[PDB]
Amino acid sequence: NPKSDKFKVKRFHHIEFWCGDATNVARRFSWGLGMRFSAKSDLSTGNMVHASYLLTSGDLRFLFTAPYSPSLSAGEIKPTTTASIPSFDHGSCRSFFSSHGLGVRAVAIEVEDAESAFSISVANGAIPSSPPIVLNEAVTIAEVKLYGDVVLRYVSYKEFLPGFERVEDASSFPLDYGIRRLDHAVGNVPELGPALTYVAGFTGFHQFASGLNSAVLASNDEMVLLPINEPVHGKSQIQTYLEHNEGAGLQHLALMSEDIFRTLREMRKRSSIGGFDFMPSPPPTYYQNLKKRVGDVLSDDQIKECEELGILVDRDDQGTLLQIFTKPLGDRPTIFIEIIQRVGCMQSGGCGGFGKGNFSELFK
Amino acid sequence: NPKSDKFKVKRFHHIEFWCGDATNVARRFSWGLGMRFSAKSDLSTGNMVHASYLLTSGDLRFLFTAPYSPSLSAGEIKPTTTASIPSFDHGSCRSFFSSHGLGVRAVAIEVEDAESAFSISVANGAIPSSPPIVLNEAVTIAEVKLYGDVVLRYVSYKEFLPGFERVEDASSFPLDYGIRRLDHAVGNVPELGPALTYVAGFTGFHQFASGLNSAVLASNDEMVLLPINEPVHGKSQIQTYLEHNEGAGLQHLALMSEDIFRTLREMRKRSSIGGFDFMPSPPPTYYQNLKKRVGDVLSDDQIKECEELGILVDRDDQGTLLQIFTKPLGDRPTIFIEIIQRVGCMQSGGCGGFGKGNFSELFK
Ligand SMILES: COc1ccc(-c2c(S(C)(=O)=O)ccc(C(=O)c3cnn(C(C)(C)C)c3O)c2C)cc1
Ligand SMILES: COc1ccc(-c2c(S(C)(=O)=O)ccc(C(=O)c3cnn(C(C)(C)C)c3O)c2C)cc1
Ligand SMILES: [Fe+3]
C-alpha cells in the first residue's frame, strides 16, 4: 500500500518454539501437522548448549528448541560457544517457558541484510534483544523485541543456519499433509495502540485494510503479516489468554495449505492418536447459509466437503478464504493454529481477509 | 524370597512424568506407545493448579502433569486447593523440570494402606516428601523420597484418583499396541550402596537374585521391582546420565507386552511420524548366535521375526525374556523405555532376568 518498509523484507523464514523438551514437542508436531524432520543442532552435532530440531512442510519451517544442563557448557564463553543460535540463553529460555509455557519465542523473517535491518530498526525505536552476528561468514541473524517475550528475528544470507545438520535417510520420513507456508502470525497484547505504534515505528510496516480490537501490519508486498489484538473489557477471549500466558505473546499461527481439504482429512485422522484437535464444527445451519454467501465460488459439493471437515468460509472482494482452528497446542489455553487456503486475487497477500465475518456468521 | 516387606504392597499403580507442557508430551506418548487417553484433571475439570492427563494400556498408567500459571490459583490455600494431586507444587515442578528435564517424578505403587505405608516407611528412615491425605474419603495418597527428586508415591483405596474425569467418546481413541503393565522401574544413582541401604531400609524390599553396578529390590511377591545402578569409573553410561540429568533419577521403564512382536511392529511404524525411535539393531551375527543359545525356546522362524524387529533375547533358568530399547524419550540423553516379554516360570516376577547376558553377547 504506501510501501513504507524501512528495510528490505523478503518473507517469513521460520517460527521458533521454546520448549521444555524439544524432542517430544517436535515429534508430536511432526506427526500432527505432517511436517518433515529436516535439520538438527544438538549433542550429536556438537551443540552443548541447546537441542534444536527443524521441521519443514513446503516453505514452512518450525524450529523446536530446549536448553541442556548448563553444566555441559560451563567452560564456554560467548567467543567459544557451541550453540548454533548465538542468541540462545539458558536462563532466558527457562524463564520464558516457566512464565508462558510452550510457545513461540521468535517470529523470523528473511531480510536482505540482517545487520542493516537491526540497526535501522533500533534507530527507529526497536528494543534490541540480540545484536547482529555473522554465522560461518554466510548467515547473519539479529533480534529485536516484538511484544511480550516474543522477538522478531532477522535472518539474511550472503539450507538452515550454519551448525545445523541435515537429517538423512529413514530418520527423515516424508510426511506431508499439504501445508505450504506461514500466512500470518498474530499476537495478543494488553494495549493495541502502543503495540502498533511501536512495531510500525521500527519496521515501517503499514496497516493492511466481539471482545477485541485488531489491526494488521504488513510489509511492502504484504506477504509478511503481523496482526495484533487487544482485549475489550466490559470476558474477552484475549483477556483470558493474557492471564494464562502471563502477558502478551503469539496467539495463533495461520498455516497456508495448497489443499485444505486434504490437510484437514489427514489432520483429523490423527487428532486422537498424537495429533491436534479442532474446535467444535459449525452447526448445519452455518452450511445452509454458506450456500447463500459463497454459492458462486464453491459448488454445493465443495460446500458439503467443507461441512464434513468442519471448514469455515468467508470473503471480502477479490477473494474468498477457507479456514479452521485447532484447539490449544499445549497445556495452557493460549496458542493455537489456523489452517487456511485463499481463493482469488491473482496470489496477493491477505486475499479474502482473515475471517472476521465468521465471528458474526458463527453466532448467527 | 525372605519376604520382608514392612507394609502390604500390591503392585505398580502408575508413573508420573513432570513436564513443561502436559498436552504435547501425553499426545506424543499416546501415539508412539499406543496408550489410550483415559482421564484428565485440568481447567475443564476445575483444576486451577495443574494440568494432568492419564494414558492407559492394559494395567499400565502413565500420568503427564504440568503447572498452570500460579496466578490462576493465587487466592487458594492448601485447605481450599483445586489441585487433584495435593502433593503438587508449582515451584517444585518448575525446579524439577528446569534441573532434570522431562522425566519421572513419581513411581506409584498401590498399597493396602497409604497412611500406614507412609508412617512405617518414615519410622524406618524414609525421607517424607508429602504426608498422607485422604481424597474424597475414598483414596489415600502419600509420598516419600526414593532417590534424586524422584518420589515413591503410595496409593490406597477404601477409576483413577478423585477429581479426575473419565474421558469419553471420540476424545478417547482406542489405541493399543500390546503393552500391558510396568515390569520394572530403574534408577541411576552416584552411590549404589547408600541408595540400596536407604530404600531397602524403609520398605523392607529384598534383593532379587561394563561401567556399572546394579541391584534389584523387590516386594514380597516380586511383582514390584525397583532396580538401581551406580557408575563405575576408570566412561560409564550411568555417569553420562547423571551429568545430563543433573543427578540421580529414573533411567528406564520396562513395559511388559503381551505380544512383543506386535508391539514392535506398531511402534516401529510410528517412529518417524511422531513416535519413538529404537536403538540400532544387533548385527546378523547376534541372531546366528541366538540360534545356539535359545534354540530350544524359540523356533528359527520366531528368531527371524526377532531379527526383523531388532528384538534382543536372553535367559536365566525357569525362563527367557525378549527385550528392546528406545532412544531417549526427550531432549536429554537420560530416560528411555524398554519393551519386554518373558517366557516361562508358570507368571513369576523377573522370569528370565533383565538381559545382563546381552551386555556381553552384544559386544560379542
Ligand atoms: C478461541 O476460539 C476462537 C478460535 C478462532 C476464532 C476466530 C474466528 S471464529 C470466531 O470464526 O472462529 C474467525 C477468524 C479468526 C481469525 O483467525 C482472525 C480474526 N481476525 N484476524 C486478525 C488478523 C485481524 C487478527 C484473524 O487472524 C479467529 C481467530 C475465534 C475464537
Ligand atoms: C544406553 O544404551 C543402552 C540401552 C540398553 C542397555 C541394556 C542392555 S544392552 C547393552 O544389551 O542393550 C541389556 C539390558 C538392559 C537392562 O534393561 C538392564 C540391565 N540390567 N538391569 C537391571 C534391572 C539389573 C538394572 C536391567 O533392567 C539394558 C538397559 C544398555 C545400554
Ligand atoms: Fe488468523
Ligand SMILES: [Fe+3]
Ligand atoms: Fe530393564
